[PDB]
């Protein structure tokens, strides 16, 4: 009955706990005791992009390391050239409350979503010079939190109704739906080889998903409050999470437990965004404090600080060739660091 | 500069020419967030104010004396709201509607008001409070079937304040109960405030037509206080 099932669940949880305790034969910080610190990392602004009218809420770099897309809650999606600070495109939206955006790897499409439970897909290269709406994808019962392209005909969405979905653009219907969380989902990140993806939920829960089968394979716990950001390490064998309790942590998918935790005693505000560097030696985090912190991944110490914002930092990104860092905050400005 | 550079700069200049029009249109429109429970009459106030003119949000536009208000109502969401509420940290006002004829559910309304009043991202946003469905309260108190002191003991020692205005000619008991309910909210509002935001209470029923003016007057008061803060 129900009681027998609950007892079985507790027993298997205990067995999993023993299996995970039996594997930690070494400490990450003790092997890395002999590694040289990177030193002090001072970074300066090279450009400041002005033009939004309200909070900037999402951002994304392009495959060409030269073009950006940015989204604001005044109802705008702007496409920038970061070399000359020129504006290439500016698109108005049907719904003002936007919470995510993305580029496509081929540079032909963009996507957006928000409180209205819809993902809108836009075409950049048309017969004329106009950017027009190609698709409206519907089927969720909650707001969209994140979306990322796989190719020109497949997209992934995560929502605040506790489920994730894979969509085929040409027809307009779901091919597979992933369930298992209890609270809302907050973020996603795609593998370098594009066959799996990770998810973090408004709980102390993160999961790994196989796209083709459509089922979960691993779950990870360890936080105290909501998870806010997540991303992949370059080799696809790690990920780093931030949470609304002033703690970041690193997980690996082969030892199946955490390895390092980045925290401090005077930090009492949560993390909003996370992003890795090219070689894996820098980990960049945003705090509503209102700062950005640059941590050394293998030592758990702050290598640098970035300041110059007057309000909460909400989005952060790095390039594919590793030549810049872009930061966007609730004061309506974007800044590029190098 | 070659042909390409001139083309790029010209296109950028046109884009800025458009954003200038957008900024003027944006700053002259006011935005309000509407909140209430399922037994509130909130839908009826929406339908009433519409005379002044699936989906996860609903929008209404109305206009008073050439000023434009956009009111936003939340639908098709779950029962947890500690995340999307943060999107509403730069609105002019929150309109909170509450049913005052149901004694069994007033405590939940009070706790809701406490949670909204003390959040981190909403310490600058003011609240306009509507106490709805007064005729039902009048009928229930006059009939005398259920006793208010069963749920709130302190009502056994409350005296009508001197600044009351029972204008229409009602029974004194209606005035006592009405002002007790109002003071229950004013106490929370006064206790934890810091002079940075206020609460404006009103008594409303299902046939009133004066709600738009009330919102209008309260908004003028809010904006004057901002402009006076600008001059120190």
């Amino acid at each position, epitope marked *: 009955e129900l009681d027998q099932l609950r007892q079985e669940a507790e027993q298997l949880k205990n067995q999993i706990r023993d299996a995970r305790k039996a594997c930690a034969d070494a400490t990450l910080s003790q092997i890395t005791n002999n590694i040289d610190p990177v030193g002090r990392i001072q970074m300066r602004t090279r450009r400041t992009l002005r033009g939004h009218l309200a909070k900037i809420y999402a951002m994304h770099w392009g495959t060409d390391s030269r073009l950006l897309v940015s989204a604001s809650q005044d109802g705008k999606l702007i496409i920038w050239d970061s070399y000359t600070t020129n504006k290439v495109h500016a698109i108005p939206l049907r719904s003002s409350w936007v919470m995510t955006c993305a580029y496509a790897p081929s540079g032909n499409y963009v996507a957006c979503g928000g409180l209205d439970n819809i993902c809108s897909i836009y075409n950049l290269k048309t017969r004329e010079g106009n950017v027009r709406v190609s698709r409206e994808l519907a089927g969720h019962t909650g707001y969209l939190s994140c979306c990322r392209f796989l190719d020109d005909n497949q997209i992934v969405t995560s929502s605040g109704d506790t489920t994730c979905a894979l969509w085929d653009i040409e027809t307009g219907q779901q091919t597979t739906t992933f369930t298992g969380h*209890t*609270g809302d989902v907050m973020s996603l990140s795609l593998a370098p080889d594009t066959r799996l993806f990770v998810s973090g939920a*408004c*709980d*102390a829960s993160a999961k790994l998903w196989d796209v083709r089968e459509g089922m979960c394979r691993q779950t990870f*716990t360890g936080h*105290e*409050s*909501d998870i806010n950001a997540i991303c992949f390490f370059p080799n696809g064998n790690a990920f780093a999470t931030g949470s*609304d*309790d002033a703690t970041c942590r690193l997980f690996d998918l082969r030892a199946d437990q955490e390895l390092m935790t980045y925290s401090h005693d005077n930090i*009492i505000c*949560g993390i909003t965004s996370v992003s890795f560097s090219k070689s894996g030696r820098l980990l960049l985090a945003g705090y509503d404090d209102f700062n950005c912190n640059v941590w050394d991944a293998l030592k758990a110490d702050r290598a640098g600080v970035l300041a110059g914002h007057d309000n909460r930092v909400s989005c952060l990104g790095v390039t594919d060739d590793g030549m810049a860092v872009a930061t966007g905050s609730w004061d309506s400005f974007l800044k590029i660091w190098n | 500069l070659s042909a390409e550079d001139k083309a790029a700069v010209e296109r950028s200049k046109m884009i800025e020419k458009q954003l200038q029009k957008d900024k003027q249109v944006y700053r002259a429109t006011h935005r309000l967030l509407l909140l209430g429970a399922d037994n509130s009459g909130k839908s009826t106030i929406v339908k009433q104010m519409r005379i002044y003119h699936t989906s996860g949000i609903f929008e209404t536009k109305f206009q008073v004396d050439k000023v434009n208000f956009h009111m936003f109502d939340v639908g098709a969401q779950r*029962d*947890e*709201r*500690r995340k999307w*509420i943060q999107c509403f940290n730069d609105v002019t006002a929150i309109i909170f509607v509450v049913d005052s004829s149901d004694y069994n559910r007033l*405590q*939940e309304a009070l*706790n809701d008001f*406490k*949670s909204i009043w*003390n*959040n*981190r991202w909403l310490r600058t946003i003011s609240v306009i409070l509507f106490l709805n469905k007064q005729d039902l309260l009048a009928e229930k108190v006059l009939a005398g079937k259920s006793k208010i002191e069963d*749920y*709130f*003991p302190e009502f056994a020692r409350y005296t009508t304040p001197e600044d009351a205005t029972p204008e229409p000619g009602e029974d004194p008991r209606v005035t006592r109960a009405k002002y007790f309910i109002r003071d229950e909210f004013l106490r929370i509002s006064t206790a934890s405030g810091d002079g940075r935001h206020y609460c404006y209470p009103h008594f409303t029923c299902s046939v009133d037509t004066e709600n738009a003016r009330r919102i209008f007057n309260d908004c003028r008061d809010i904006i004057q206080r901002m402009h006076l803060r600008q001059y120190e």
Partner: nanobody
Amino acid sequence: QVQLQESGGGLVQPGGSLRLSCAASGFTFSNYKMNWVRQAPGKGLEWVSDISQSGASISYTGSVKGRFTISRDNAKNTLYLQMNSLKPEDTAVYYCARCPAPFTRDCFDVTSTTYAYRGQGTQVTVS
């Protein structure tokens, strides 16, 4: 992994008394605001009592204002409630509830149909 476990239920006569204990694991106990909620046979989730980080601020609902007493032990990781005179209108299932964020005075989403950080509950019957 956040865990909350309740204890102290049972059956009593009208006018009786008993004590409820909530035990915790998986977080720093000191930084969080704490609550008592209950569910009666045929209704939704209600709110009974509230206590703050240090214990210098308390709050009760009207219907139990003169009878039930709340306390917290931050060193033993426990929340305590004491019941002195019971009516038949108290037969219910009792849960102890946490808050989503540390260092905060607001408290959203405790009485919801699904909430992450909440225990299994205990049964109290008076007859």
